[PDB]
Tab-separated table of C-alpha atoms and ligand atoms in Angstrom:
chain	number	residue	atom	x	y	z
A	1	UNK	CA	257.226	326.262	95.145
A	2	UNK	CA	253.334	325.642	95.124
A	3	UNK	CA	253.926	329.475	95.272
A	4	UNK	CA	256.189	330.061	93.004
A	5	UNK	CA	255.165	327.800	90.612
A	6	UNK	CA	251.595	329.497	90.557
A	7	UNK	CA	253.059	332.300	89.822
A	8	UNK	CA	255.810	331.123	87.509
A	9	UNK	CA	252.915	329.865	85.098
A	10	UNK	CA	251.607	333.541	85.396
A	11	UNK	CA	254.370	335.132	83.463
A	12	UNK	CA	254.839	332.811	81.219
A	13	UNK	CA	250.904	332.383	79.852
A	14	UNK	CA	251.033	336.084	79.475
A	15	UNK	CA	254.284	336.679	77.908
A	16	UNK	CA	253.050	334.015	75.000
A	17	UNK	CA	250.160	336.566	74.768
A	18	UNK	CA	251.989	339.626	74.434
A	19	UNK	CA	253.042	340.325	71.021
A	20	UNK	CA	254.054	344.364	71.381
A	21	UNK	CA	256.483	346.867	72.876
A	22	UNK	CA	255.473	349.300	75.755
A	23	UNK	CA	252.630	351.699	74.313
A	24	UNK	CA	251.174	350.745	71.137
A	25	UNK	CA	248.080	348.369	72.172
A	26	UNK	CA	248.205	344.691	71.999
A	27	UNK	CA	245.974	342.507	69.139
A	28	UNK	CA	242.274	341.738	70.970
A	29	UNK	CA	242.148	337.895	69.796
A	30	UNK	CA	245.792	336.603	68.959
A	31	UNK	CA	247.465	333.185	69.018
A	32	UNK	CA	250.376	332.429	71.670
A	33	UNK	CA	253.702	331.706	71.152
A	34	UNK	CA	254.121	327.616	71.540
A	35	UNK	CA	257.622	328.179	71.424
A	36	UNK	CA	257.431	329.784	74.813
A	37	UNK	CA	254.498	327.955	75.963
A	38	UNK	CA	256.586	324.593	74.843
A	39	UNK	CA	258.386	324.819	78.107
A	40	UNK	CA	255.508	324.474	80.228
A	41	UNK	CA	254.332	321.802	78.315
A	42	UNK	CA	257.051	319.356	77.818
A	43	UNK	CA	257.769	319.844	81.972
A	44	UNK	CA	258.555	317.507	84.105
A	45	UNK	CA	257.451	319.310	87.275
A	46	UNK	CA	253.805	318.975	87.798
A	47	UNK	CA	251.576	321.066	86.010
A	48	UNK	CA	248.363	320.406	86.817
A	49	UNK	CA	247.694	321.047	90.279
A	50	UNK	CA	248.573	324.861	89.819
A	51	UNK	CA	247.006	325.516	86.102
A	52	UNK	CA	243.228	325.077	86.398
A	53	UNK	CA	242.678	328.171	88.075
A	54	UNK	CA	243.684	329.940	85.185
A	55	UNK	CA	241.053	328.508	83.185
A	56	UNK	CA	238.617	331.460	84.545
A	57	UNK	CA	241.622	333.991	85.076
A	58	UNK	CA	240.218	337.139	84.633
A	59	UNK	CA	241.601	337.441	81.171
A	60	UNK	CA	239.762	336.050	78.613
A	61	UNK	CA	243.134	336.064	76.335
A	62	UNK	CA	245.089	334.196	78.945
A	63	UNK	CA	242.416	331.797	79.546
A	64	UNK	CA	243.140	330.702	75.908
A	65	UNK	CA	247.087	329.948	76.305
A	66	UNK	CA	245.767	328.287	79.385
A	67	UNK	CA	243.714	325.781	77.860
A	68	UNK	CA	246.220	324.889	75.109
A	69	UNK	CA	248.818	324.140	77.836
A	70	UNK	CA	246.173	321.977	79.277
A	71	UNK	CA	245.023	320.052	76.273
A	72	UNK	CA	249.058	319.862	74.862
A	73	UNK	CA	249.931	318.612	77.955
A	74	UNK	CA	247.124	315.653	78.794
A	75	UNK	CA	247.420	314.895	74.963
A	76	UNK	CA	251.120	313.627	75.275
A	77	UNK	CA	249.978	309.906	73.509
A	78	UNK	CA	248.147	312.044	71.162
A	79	UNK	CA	248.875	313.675	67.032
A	80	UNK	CA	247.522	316.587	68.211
A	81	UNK	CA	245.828	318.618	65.848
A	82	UNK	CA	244.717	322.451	65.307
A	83	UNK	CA	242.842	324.004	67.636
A	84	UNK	CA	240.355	326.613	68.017
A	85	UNK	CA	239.424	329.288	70.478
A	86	UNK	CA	235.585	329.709	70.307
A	87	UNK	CA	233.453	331.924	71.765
A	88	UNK	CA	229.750	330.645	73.737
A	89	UNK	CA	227.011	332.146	75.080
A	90	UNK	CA	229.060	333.577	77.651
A	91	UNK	CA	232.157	331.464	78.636
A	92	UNK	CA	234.381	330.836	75.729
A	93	UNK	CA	234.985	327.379	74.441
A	94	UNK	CA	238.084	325.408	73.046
A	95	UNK	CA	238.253	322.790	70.543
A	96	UNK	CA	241.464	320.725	69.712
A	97	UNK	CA	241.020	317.840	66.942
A	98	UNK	CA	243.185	314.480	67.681
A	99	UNK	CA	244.403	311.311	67.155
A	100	UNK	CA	246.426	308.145	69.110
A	101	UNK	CA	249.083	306.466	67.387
A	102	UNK	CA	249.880	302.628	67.792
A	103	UNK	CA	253.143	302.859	70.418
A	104	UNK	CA	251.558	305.557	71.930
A	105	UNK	CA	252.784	304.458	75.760
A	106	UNK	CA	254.086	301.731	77.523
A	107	UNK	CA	251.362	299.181	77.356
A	108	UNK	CA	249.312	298.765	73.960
A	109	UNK	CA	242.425	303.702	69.405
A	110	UNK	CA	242.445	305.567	72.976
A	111	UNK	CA	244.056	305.569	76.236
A	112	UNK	CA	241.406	305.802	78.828
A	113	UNK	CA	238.820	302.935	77.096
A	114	UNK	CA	240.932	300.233	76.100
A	115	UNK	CA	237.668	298.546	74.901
A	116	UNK	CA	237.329	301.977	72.008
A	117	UNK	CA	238.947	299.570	69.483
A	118	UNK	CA	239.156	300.999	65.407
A	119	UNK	CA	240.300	299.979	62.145
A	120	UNK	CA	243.445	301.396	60.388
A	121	UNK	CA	240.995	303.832	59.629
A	122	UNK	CA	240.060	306.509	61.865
A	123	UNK	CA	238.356	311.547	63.709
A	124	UNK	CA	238.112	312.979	66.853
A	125	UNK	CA	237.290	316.079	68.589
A	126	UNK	CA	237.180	317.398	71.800
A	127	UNK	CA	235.754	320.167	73.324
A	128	UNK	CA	237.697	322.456	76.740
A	129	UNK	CA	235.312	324.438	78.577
A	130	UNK	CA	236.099	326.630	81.724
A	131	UNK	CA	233.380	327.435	84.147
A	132	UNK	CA	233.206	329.374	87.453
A	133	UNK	CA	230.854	327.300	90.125
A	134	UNK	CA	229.097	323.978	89.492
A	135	UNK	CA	225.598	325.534	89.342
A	136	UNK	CA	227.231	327.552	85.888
A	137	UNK	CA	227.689	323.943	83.793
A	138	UNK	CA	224.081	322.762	82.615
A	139	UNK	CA	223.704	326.120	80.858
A	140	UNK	CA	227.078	326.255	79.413
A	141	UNK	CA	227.120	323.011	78.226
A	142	UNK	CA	224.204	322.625	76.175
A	143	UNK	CA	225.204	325.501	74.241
A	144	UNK	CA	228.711	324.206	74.025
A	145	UNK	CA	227.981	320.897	72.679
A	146	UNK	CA	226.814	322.905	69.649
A	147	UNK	CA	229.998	323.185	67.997
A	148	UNK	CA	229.852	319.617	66.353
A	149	UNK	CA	231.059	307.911	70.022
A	150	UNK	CA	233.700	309.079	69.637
A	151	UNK	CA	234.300	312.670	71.002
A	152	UNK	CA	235.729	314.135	74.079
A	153	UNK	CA	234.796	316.776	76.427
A	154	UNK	CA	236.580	317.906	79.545
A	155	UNK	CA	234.767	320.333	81.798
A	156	UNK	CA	236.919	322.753	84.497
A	157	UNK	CA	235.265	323.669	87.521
A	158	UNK	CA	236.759	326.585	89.271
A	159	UNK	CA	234.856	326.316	92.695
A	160	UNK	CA	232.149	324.255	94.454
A	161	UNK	CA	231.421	326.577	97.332
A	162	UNK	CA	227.817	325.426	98.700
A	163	UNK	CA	228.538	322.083	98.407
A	164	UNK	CA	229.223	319.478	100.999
A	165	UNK	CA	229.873	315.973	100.538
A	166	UNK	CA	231.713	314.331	97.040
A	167	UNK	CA	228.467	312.346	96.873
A	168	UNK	CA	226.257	315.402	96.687
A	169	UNK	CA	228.581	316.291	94.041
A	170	UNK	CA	228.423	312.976	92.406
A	171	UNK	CA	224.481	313.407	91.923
A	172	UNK	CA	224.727	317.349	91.071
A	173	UNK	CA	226.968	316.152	88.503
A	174	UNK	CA	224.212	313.180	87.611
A	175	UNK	CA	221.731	315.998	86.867
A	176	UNK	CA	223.706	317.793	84.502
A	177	UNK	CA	224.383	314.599	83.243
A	178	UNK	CA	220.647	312.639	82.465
A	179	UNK	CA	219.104	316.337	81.437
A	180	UNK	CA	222.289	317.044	78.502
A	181	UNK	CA	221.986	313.344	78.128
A	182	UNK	CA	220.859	312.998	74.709
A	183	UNK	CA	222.622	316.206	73.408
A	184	UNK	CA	226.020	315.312	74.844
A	185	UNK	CA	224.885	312.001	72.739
A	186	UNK	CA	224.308	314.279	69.709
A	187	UNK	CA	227.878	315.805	69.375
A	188	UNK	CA	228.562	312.026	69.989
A	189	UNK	CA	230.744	312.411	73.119
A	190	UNK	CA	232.249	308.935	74.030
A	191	UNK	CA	233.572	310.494	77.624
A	192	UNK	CA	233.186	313.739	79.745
A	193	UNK	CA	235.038	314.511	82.690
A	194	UNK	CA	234.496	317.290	85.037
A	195	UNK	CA	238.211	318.767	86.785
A	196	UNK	CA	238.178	320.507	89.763
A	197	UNK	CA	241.184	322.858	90.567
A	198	UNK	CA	242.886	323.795	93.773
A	199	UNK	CA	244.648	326.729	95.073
A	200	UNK	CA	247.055	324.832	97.993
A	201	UNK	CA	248.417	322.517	95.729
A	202	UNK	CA	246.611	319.566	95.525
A	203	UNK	CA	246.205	317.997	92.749
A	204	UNK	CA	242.708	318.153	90.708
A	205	UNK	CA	240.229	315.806	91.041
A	206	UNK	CA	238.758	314.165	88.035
A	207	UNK	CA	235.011	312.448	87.756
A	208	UNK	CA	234.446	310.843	84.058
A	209	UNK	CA	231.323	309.299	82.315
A	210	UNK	CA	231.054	307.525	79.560
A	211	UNK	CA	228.704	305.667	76.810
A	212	UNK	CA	224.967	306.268	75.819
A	213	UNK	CA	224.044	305.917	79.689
A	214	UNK	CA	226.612	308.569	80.696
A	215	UNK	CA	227.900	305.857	84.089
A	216	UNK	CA	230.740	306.624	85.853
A	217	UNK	CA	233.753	305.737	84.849
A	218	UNK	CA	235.044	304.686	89.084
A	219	UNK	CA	238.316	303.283	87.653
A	220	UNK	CA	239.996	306.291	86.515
A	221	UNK	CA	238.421	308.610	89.302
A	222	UNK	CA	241.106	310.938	89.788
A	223	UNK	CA	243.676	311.410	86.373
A	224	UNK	CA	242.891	313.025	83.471
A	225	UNK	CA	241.486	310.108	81.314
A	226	UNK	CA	243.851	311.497	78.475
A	227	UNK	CA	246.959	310.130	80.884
A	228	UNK	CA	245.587	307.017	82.435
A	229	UNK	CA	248.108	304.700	80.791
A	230	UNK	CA	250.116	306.022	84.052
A	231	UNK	CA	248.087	303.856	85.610
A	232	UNK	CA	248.167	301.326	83.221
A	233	UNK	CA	245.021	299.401	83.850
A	234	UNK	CA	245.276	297.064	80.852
A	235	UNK	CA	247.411	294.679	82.505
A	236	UNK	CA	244.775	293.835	84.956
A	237	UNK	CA	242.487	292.430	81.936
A	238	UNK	CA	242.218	289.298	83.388
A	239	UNK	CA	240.700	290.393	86.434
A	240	UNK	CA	237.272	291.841	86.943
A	241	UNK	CA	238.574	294.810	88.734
A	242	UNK	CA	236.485	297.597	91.343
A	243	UNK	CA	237.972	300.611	92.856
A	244	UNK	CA	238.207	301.450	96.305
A	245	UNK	CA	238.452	305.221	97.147
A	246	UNK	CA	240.873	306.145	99.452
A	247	UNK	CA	241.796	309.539	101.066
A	248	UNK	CA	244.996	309.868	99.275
A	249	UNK	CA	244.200	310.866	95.581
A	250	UNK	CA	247.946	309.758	93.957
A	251	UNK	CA	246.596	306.411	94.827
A	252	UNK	CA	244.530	303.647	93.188
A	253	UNK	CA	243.704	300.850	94.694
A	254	UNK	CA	241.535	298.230	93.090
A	255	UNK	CA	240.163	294.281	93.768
A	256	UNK	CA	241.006	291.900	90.963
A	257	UNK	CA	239.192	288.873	90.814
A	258	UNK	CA	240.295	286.456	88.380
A	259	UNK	CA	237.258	286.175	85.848
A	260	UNK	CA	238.123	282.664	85.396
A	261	UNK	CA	238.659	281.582	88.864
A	262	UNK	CA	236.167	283.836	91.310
A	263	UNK	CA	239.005	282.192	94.144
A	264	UNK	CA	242.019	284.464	92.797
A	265	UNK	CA	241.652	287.429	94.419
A	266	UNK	CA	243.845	290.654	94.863
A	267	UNK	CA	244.782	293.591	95.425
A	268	UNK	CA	246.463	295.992	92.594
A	269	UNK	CA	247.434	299.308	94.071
A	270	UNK	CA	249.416	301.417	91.751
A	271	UNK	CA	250.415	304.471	92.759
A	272	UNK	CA	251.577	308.223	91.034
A	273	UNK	CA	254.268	310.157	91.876
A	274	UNK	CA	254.607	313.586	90.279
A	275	UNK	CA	257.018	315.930	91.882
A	276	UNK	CA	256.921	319.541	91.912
A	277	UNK	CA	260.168	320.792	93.924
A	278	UNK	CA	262.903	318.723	94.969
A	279	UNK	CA	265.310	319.964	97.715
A	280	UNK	CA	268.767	321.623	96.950
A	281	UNK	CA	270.561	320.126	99.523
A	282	UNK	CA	269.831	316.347	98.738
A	283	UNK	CA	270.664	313.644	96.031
A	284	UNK	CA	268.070	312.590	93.249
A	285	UNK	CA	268.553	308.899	94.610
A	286	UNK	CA	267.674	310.048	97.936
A	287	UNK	CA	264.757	312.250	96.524
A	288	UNK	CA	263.195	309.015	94.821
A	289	UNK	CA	263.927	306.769	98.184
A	290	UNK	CA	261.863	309.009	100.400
A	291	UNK	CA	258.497	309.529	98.695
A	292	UNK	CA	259.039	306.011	97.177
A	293	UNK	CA	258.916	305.122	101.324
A	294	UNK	CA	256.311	307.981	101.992
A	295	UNK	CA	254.222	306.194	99.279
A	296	UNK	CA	254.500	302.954	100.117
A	297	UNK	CA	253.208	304.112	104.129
A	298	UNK	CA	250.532	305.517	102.915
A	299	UNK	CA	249.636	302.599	100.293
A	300	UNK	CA	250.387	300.020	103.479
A	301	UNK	CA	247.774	301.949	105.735
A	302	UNK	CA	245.231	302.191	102.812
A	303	UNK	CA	245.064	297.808	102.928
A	304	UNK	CA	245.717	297.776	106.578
A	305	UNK	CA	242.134	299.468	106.913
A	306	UNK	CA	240.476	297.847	104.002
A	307	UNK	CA	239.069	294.410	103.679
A	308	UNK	CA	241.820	292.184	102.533
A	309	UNK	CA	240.200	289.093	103.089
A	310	UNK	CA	241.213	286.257	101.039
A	311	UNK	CA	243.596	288.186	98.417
A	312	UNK	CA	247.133	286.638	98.112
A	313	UNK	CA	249.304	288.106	95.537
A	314	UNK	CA	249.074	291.718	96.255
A	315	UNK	CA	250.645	293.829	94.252
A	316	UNK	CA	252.420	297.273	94.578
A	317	UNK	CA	253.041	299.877	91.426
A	318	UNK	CA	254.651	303.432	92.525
A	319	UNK	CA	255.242	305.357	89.211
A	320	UNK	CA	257.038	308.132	89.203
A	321	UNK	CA	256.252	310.948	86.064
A	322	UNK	CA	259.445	313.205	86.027
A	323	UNK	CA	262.620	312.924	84.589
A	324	UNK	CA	265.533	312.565	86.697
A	325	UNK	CA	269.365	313.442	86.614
A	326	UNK	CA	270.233	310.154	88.186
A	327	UNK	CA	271.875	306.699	87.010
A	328	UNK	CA	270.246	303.355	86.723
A	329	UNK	CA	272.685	301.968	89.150
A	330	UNK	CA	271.808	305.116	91.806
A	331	UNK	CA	268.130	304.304	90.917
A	332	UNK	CA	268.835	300.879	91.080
A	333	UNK	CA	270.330	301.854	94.386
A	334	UNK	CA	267.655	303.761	95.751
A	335	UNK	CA	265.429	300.602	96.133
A	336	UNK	CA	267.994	297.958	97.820
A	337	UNK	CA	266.547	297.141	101.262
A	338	UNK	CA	263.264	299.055	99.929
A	339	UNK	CA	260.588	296.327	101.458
A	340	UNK	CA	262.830	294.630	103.486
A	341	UNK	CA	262.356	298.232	105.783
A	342	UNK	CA	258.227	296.850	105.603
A	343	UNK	CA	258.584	293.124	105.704
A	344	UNK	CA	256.155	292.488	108.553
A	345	UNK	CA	253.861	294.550	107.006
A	346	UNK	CA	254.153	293.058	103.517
A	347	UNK	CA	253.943	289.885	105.091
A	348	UNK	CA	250.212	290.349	107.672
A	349	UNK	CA	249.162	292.100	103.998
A	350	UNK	CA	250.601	289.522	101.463
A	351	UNK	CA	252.240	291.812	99.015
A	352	UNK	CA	254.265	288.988	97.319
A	353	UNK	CA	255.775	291.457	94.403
A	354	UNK	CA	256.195	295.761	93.813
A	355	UNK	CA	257.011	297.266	90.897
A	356	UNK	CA	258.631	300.953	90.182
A	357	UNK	CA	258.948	303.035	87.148
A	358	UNK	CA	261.372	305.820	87.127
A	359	UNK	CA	262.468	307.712	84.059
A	360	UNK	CA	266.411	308.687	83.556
A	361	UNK	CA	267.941	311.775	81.915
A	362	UNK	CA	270.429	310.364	79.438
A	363	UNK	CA	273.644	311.589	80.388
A	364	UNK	CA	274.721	311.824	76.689
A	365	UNK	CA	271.468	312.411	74.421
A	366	UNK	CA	269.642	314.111	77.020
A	367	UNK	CA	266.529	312.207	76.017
A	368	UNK	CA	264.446	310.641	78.545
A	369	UNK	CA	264.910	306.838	79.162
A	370	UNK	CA	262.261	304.433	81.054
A	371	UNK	CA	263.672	302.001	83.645
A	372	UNK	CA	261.589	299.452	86.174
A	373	UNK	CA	262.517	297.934	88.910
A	374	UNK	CA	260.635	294.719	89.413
A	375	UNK	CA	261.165	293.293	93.176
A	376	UNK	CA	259.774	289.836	93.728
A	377	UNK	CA	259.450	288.710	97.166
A	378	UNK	CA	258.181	285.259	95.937
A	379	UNK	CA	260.565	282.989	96.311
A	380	UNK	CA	260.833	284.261	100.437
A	381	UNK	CA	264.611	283.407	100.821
A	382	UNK	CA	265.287	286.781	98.979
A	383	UNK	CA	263.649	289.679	97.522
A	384	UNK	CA	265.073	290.148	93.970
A	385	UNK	CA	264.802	293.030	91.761
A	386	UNK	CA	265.533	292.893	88.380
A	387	UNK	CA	265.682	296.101	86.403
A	388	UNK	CA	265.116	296.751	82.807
A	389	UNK	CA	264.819	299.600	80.570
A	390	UNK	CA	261.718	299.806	78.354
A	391	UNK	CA	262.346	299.187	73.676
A	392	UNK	CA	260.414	298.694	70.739
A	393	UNK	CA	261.116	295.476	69.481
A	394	UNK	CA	260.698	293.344	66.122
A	395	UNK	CA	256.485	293.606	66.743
A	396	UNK	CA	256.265	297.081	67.499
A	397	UNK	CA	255.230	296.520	70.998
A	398	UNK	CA	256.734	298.068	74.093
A	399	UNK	CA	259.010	295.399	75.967
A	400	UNK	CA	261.218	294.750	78.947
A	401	UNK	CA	264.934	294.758	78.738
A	402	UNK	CA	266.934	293.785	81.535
A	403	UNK	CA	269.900	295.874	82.348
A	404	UNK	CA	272.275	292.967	83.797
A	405	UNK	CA	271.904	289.558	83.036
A	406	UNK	CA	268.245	288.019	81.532
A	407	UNK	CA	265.133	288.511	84.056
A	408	UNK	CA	262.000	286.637	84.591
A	409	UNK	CA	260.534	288.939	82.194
A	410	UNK	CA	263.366	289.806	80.176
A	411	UNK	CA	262.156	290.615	76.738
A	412	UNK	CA	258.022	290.649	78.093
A	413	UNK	CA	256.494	292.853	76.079
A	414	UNK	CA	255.481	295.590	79.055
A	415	UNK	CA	251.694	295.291	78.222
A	416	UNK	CA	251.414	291.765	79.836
A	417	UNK	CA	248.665	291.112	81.793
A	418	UNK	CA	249.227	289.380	85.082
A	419	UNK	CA	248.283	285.832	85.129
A	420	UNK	CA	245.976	283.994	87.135
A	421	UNK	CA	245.881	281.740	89.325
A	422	UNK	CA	245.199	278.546	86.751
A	423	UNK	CA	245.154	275.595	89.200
A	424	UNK	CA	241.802	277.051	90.329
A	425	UNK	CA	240.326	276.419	87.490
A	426	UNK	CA	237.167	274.317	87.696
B	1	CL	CL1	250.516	317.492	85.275
């Protein structure tokens, strides 16, 4: 597929392109079709892993439909505006204007920096700029920035050959950052995130900086900032949270500490599951129960290496980003027995509680509907799971809604954050 795929997206960037019969020559500088290019945005395969390098195709009129797919595509949450193909100093340059509603996603001014709070009354740009090897960027971007916190700037990378370790990456990237420092601050760029593509398959990796003192941003390392609600770090607000990196870049891992009880501490993993080819021969339920176990392996050995020392009520998030053919009952399904199969190792780690998100093809509408299972293992005698679909209620806000009888959190709105341990409170 990985294959296939790569070349799938091929054919269809430049078929939006092409505009003319056999013969007669095509326009230099024309728009593409979003009609065609709408089915490789509203996907739920993967995208992302196989697109980047297309960013410095060869083609500079490809390049274009390429970027657009990109920004339309990591700009889900978003009222996405016009956007522009520019032209730099060499590499061109692509602007796309935006703004984020108020149900944008499951758990609610923007997605990434939950702290990037606004009136009623809010204008923001952001700037797409493909470049060839990491030594390219610090003249590109100066010159880039031109086109002028609140703005946005996302910078591909299409190779880092001559480099070793991340961390002499990191500091490369530090450079570029402390010498564009006050002109990134001119065009008044809130967050910029350099996005390194792959060739095999793997999935881009993402470094982001933010503010005046252009920091990274360690808790949304690897996603596109636009999509981090998949990660959905507000409901750890009540918990000073720190990442640890792990080998395995669908995963996040990260300590909580309870700011008002420095004794609460845990561990929030959540991972991501996008999918890019399922299997002919096999059922969707079966699909979601195997990289659902995969996963949750490969989560397990992640705190069965790391320093889980006095963390009690750790807690599990696999999210998966496709849309699926299968029934809430099969999904539902899917997860019976789903710890039980790691109970010793849930119990040497203390994962008391998991919870999955899956989203369902309507058999009728077609439209795509949101369940989660929520297994609690609290309680020992049993491991329930409840399951609920996601609504809008009376408020506005995003809320549980149990499929069977009432759960614990049966009309929650979804953006809860976990609560703390109390009775350690001095
Ligand atoms: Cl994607």
């Amino acid at each position: 597929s990985v294959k296939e795929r790569t070349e799938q997206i091929e054919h269809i960037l430049k078929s939006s392109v092409v505009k003319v019969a056999y013969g007669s020559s095509n326009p230099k500088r024309s728009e593409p079709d979003l009609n065609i290019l709408k089915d490789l945005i509203d996907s739920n395969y993967v995208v992302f892993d196989v697109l980047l390098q297309f960013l410095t195709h060869q083609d500079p009129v490809v390049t274009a439909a390429a970027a657009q797919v990109y920004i339309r595509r990591a700009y889900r949450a978003y009222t996405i505006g016009d956007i522009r193909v520019h032209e730099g100093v060499t590499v061109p340059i692509v602007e796309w204007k935006f703004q984020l509603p108020s149900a944008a996603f499951s758990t609610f001014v923007s997605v990434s920096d939950l702290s990037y709070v606004a009136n009623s009354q809010s204008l923001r740009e952001g700037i797409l700029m493909a470049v060839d090897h990491l030594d390219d960027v610090d003249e590109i971007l100066s010159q880039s920035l031109e086109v002028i916190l609140s703005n946005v700037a996302n910078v591909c990378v299409a190779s880092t050959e001559g480099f070793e370790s991340e961390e002499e990456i990191l500091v490369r990237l530090r450079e570029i950052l402390d010498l564009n420092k006050q002109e990134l601050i001119n065009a008044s760029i809130r967050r910029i995130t350099f996005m390194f593509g792959f060739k095999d398959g793997s999935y881009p990796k993402y470094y982001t900086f933010n503010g005046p003192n252009y920091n990274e941003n360690e808790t949304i390392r690897h996603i596109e900032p636009a999509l981090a609600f998949q990660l959905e770090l507000g409901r750890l607000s009540n918990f000073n949270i720190k990442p640890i990196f792990t080998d395995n870049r669908n995963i996040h891992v990260y300590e909580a500490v309870s700011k008002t009880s420095p004794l609460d501490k845990r561990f929030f993993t959540r991972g991501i599951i996008r999918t890019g080819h399922i299997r002919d021969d096999i059922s969707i339920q079966e699909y979601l129960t195997s990289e659902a176990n995969r996963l949750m392996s490969d989560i397990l050995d992640n705190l069965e290496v790391t320093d889980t020392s006095n963390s009690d009520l750790n807690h599990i998030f696999i999210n998966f980003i496709a849309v699926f053919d299968i029934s809430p009952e099969d999904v539902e399904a899917a997860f019976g027995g789903f710890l039980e199969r790691f109970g010793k190792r849930l119990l040497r780690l203390r994962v008391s509680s998991a919870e999955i998100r899956i989203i369902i093809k309507d058999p009728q509408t077609g439209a795509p509907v949101p369940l989660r299972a929520l297994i609690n293992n609290v309680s020992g005698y049993v491991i329930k799971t409840e399951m609920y679909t996601e609504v809008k209620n009376a408020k506005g806000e995003w809320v549980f809604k149990s499929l069977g009888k009432p759960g614990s959190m049966h009309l929650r709105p979804i953006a809860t954050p976990y609560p703390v341990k109390e009775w350690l409170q001095p």
